[PDB]
Design a protein around this nucleic acid. Structure first.
Lengths: 20, 110, 219, 50, 488
RNA sequence: GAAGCCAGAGGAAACUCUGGUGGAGGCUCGCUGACGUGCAAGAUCGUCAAAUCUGAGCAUGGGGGCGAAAG
């Protein structure tokens, strides 16, 4: 579950969580 | 809209050539030998300007006979083995087939 | 509001991690250590400090020269003269040892210090081996040996007082108390850090008053 | 190297004979001159030069 | 203008060949002559018109060089076709090798020729000089400049590979590609490598007279025996073509691995993981030891390479046929498990972790680590048979890593450990309930082997820092971990 | 006793019902074992026989192990 849906590569883009 | 490209390669495929190659590799007969029994009755025979039917009839009926070795035969078999010759799937289904064959033999015995 | 600040600080320190620009990273890490001491927010900086160590400048032997030690409170950049200079070597080692000391004394009490220092200790030991297989920088060698010794001692201290701490998943009273009744000079790292702070302050006094006498003599 | 073993197993070298040299434990490969002798004996056209 | 005269001539020629091809055999040359004009617009239109006729006129088969009335008509027609088509391919090659830049007046002659080449590739592969056409294609996709023509040729070859059911076109293309890679010394843009992944082959009462009826029976039995023979022959030839193509593909892969080209390792490993189940057994074992030697060489960038090799080995073992082959083929992943366990600490300290349909070639080292951890702890097969010692050791090591590793990756690690606790549970509850701590030894952190490090003689005390980490995501992830530990 | 077709009644149509005509069915009447899969501690799914009756003529395949088959 969590393992796969965070092992997808697109999860680590790097967008600063202030520009939401 | 708006209508990298830039001597013959010798390949041994025959059991007789593999046997002779083993004979060179192991210290049984040397270069001087190989020339010496090269000078035989099949030597100095014309092959250049001959018709294909003549040449093929001599090829089929005039193959010299030499001993072959089990090592050379196995070497040719290993060389000519295909890369997809023994997949896991094929060998597993072969085992399944033979196990089924013994099961059927037992039930026929029953 | 801490999350965006630490995010942008890490981004700033990892933008272009170069030997010329160690001190900007260094000042940012000092700022983050101040923030960590004030708040109760864990900020991983061991990766940054260990990268500073595992930079390129630290491997090759230094360059013997005679130039002035950097004032790492007024530098945004490293002068082109200071490239392989043993003086730059000594400086950067000094404040690397510093920032490591404040970080590991900052988290010197929690029940997991043992674990928290394991990677750092093994990395430092790998470096002592690799650099006595590198340069000839014995002052930094000795300082890192002392630091890793203190880290191991403090790790052994917490585990000694850990043994009997019932941490059942539905009962965390003892772990929420651990050593509420201790102060950060009792731990071996606390003692080492306060001693190093005293030494840093006396050297600060030496050089400040010194430069004052040279100014007066020139006048 | 295991990669080299895989490579020459996939495409066997020219002089591969399946034997091992007793002098040096590596497998024994025929030379270009030895392959020329193999050709000369197998076809019989030119037993010796000149 | 002269362009209008050419318009009329080309239209007349094309329509004449569409309507009555045999009666007009010389237009194939006439068309080359009308294309010989120096006007660029006429050249472009001649090239596209030639593309159109040569497309519709080429027979569903190849013809023989004659050498040595209707039959002579057909003979002449056919010979003119081949000669004209050969001329067409030569013209396309010259135009494509010509310089792309001119004044901006639409798509250049080079781009139009490349489009024509792609259309011919996808339309009539079976006909002669497929080799020359594919040589044009490879001469384009051997340059290391991503361009629109590059991508167009790319999907052209991709569609050829995914639609070729016979195999000769695939064999010629893979031979050309492998020769090009070897000649260019493996300086390609990894798309030509993914083509090898994109191969397919590696995966009303009509009255009839008495004479008419007997003859029809004759063709009936003749066609029956021919269908049986064709089935057998097609099976054998498909197998042989597969063998040749697999030989070339694996030779390329292993030469790339031996040369250690950094930017192709992911694609090469993906291909190996995809096709090792198509290659023999002994080669499967040899490939496992090849991966082992790659890991050892990296031991003596490096983190990413090691993680790629580990992922490939584990995926190959999770292959179904390999999974059943397991014991008989003597495939032990103990080396890979131990290497991952030992490298966890250095990976935790590595600051390059987050600097970045597919299964192997993943650009992020954290993602590779997550895949390795999923393989070791949550496997597709025998999920509830994993050694509890292995589970507990990896849980402790991953908690330490997540303590010492950046925010988003740490969130991923917490999610993976939450999944591990969900799946196993009772096996690892002792790692957090201190009343069940074993006292048959002491925990050895800097161990050498997973069983050597006593995992159940310790307690996961890290939470006391990861609940005060700066990131709400990891904080709530740890909260979820404790929640499900509690709801065990 | 199914498709197909016809008529009446509702539904915009698609349809639904009724009454029929029709007479196709791996539909009825007369006097289990053997394995395989399993990814667990065994579930489910698949495969193999039981193969119109009968006069006069006619042909073929046969054991075992090895092996991917070719042998």
């Amino acid at each position: 579950n969590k393992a796969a849906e965070m092992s997808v590569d697109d999860f680590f883009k790097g967008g600063f969580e202030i520009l939401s | 809209p708006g209508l990298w490209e830039e001597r013959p390669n010798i390949d041994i495929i025959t059991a007789e050539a593999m046997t002779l190659a083993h004979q060179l590799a192991t210290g049984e007969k040397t270069k001087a030998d190989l020339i010496d029994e090269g000078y035989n009755k099949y030597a100095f025979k014309q092959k250049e300007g001959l018709p294909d039917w003549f040449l093929e009839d001599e090829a089929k009926h005039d193959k010299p006979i030499k001993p072959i070795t089990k090592e050379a035969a196995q070497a040719i078999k290993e060389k000519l083995r295909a890369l997809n010759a023994r997949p896991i799937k094929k060998v597993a289904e072969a085992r399944a087939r033979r196990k089924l064959r013994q099961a059927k033999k037992l039930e026929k015995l029953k | 509001l801490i999350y965006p600040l630490v995010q942008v600080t890490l981004g700033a320190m990892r933008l272009i991690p170069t030997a010329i620009y160690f001190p900007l990273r260094f000042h940012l890490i000092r700022s983050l250590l101040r923030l960590s001491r004030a708040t109760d927010t864990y900020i991983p900086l061991a990766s940054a400090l260990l990268e500073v160590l595992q930079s390129a400048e630290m491997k090759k032997p230094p360059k013997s020269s005679t130039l002035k030690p950097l004032d790492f409170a007024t530098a945004y950049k490293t002068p082109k003269s200071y490239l392989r200079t043993r003086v730059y070597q000594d400086g950067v080692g000094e404040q690397v040892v510093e920032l490591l000391s404040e970080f590991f004394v900052l988290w010197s009490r929690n029940i997991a210090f043992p674990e928290f220092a394991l990677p750092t200790i093994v990395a430092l030991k790998r470096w002592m081996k690799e650099m006595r297989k590198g340069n000839k920088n014995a002052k930094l060698g000795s300082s890192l040996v002392v630091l890793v010794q203190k880290l191991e001692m403090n790790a052994k201290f917490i585990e000694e007082r850990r043994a009997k701490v019932d941490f059942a998943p539905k009962d965390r009273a003892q772990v929420d108390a651990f050593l509420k009744d201790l102060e950060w000079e009792k731990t071996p790292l606390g003692a080492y850090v306060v001693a190093q702070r005293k030494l840093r302050e006396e050297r600060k006094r030496l050089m400040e008053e010194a430069r004052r006498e040279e100014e007066r003599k020139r006048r | 190297d295991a990669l080299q073993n895989l490579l020459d197993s996939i495409e066997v070298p020219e002089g591969w004979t399946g034997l091992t040299d007793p002098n040096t434990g590596k497998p024994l490969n025929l030379s270009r001159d030895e392959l020329e002798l193999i050709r000369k004996v197998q076809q019989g056209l030119i037993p010796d030069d000149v | 203008e002269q362009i209008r005269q050419a318009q009329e001539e080309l239209a007349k020629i094309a329509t004449q060949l569409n309507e009555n091809p045999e009666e007009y055999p010389g237009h194939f040359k006439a068309l080359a002559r009308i294309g010989e004009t120096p006007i660029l617009a006429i050249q472009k239109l001649c090239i596209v018109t030639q593309m159109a006729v040569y497309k519709d006129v080429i027979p569903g088969y190849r013809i023989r060089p004659l050498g040595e009335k209707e039959v002579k008509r057909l003979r002449t027609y056919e010979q003119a076709l081949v000669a004209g088509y050969h001329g067409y391919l030569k013209t396309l090659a010259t135009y494509a090798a010509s310089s792309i830049p001119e004044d901006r007046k639409g798509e250049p002659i080079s781009s139009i020729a490349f489009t024509c080449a792609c259309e011919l590739v996808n339309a009539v592969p079976h006909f002669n000089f497929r080799g020359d056409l594919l040589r044009i294609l490879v001469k384009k996709l051997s340059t290391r400049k991503i361009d629109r023509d590059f991508v167009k040729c790319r999907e052209a070859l991709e569609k050829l590979f995914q639609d070729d059911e016979e195999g000769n076109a695939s064999q010629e293309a893979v031979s050309l590609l492998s020769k090009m890679m070897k000649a260019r010394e493996y300086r390609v843009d990894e798309s030509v490598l993914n083509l090898f992944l994109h191969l397919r082959l590696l995966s009303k009462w009509e009255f009839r007279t008495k004479k008419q009826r007997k003859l029809l029976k004759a063709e009936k039995e003749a066609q029956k025996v021919m269908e049986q023979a064709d089935a057998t022959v097609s099976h054998e030839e498909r197998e042989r073509i597969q063998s040749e193509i697999l030989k070339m593909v694996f030779a390329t892969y292993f030469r790339i691995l031996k040369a250690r080209v950094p930017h192709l390792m992911g694609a090469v490993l993906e291909g190996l993981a995809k096709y090792a189940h198509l290659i023999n057994q002994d080669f499967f074992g040899d490939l496992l030891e090849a991966l082992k030697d790659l890991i050892r060489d990296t031991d003596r960038d490096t983190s990413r390479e090691s993680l790629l090799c580990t992922v490939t080995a584990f995926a190959l073992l999770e292959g179904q046929d390999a999974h059943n082959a397991r014991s008989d083929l003597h495939l032990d992943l103990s080396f890979f498990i131990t290497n991952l366990y030992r490298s966890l600490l250095s990976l935790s300290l590595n600051p390059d972790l987050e600097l970045g349909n597919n299964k192997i070639n993943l650009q992020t080292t954290t993602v590779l680590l997550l895949r390795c951890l999923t393989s070791v702890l949550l496997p597709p097969w025998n999920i509830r048979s994993v050694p509890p010692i292995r589970l507990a050791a990896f849980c402790k090591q991953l908690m330490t890593l997540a303590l010492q590793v950046p925010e988003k990756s740490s969130q991923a690690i917490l999610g993976l450990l939450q999944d591990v606790v969900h799946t196993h549970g009772r096996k690892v509850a002792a790692l957090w309930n201190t009343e069940e701590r074993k006292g048959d030894g002491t925990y050895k952190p800097l161990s050498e082997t997973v069983e050597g490090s006593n995992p159940f003689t310790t307690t996961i005390w890290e939470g006391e820092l990861l609940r005060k980490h700066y990131c709400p995501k990891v904080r709530e992830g740890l909260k979820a971990m404790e929640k499900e530990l509690r709801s065990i």
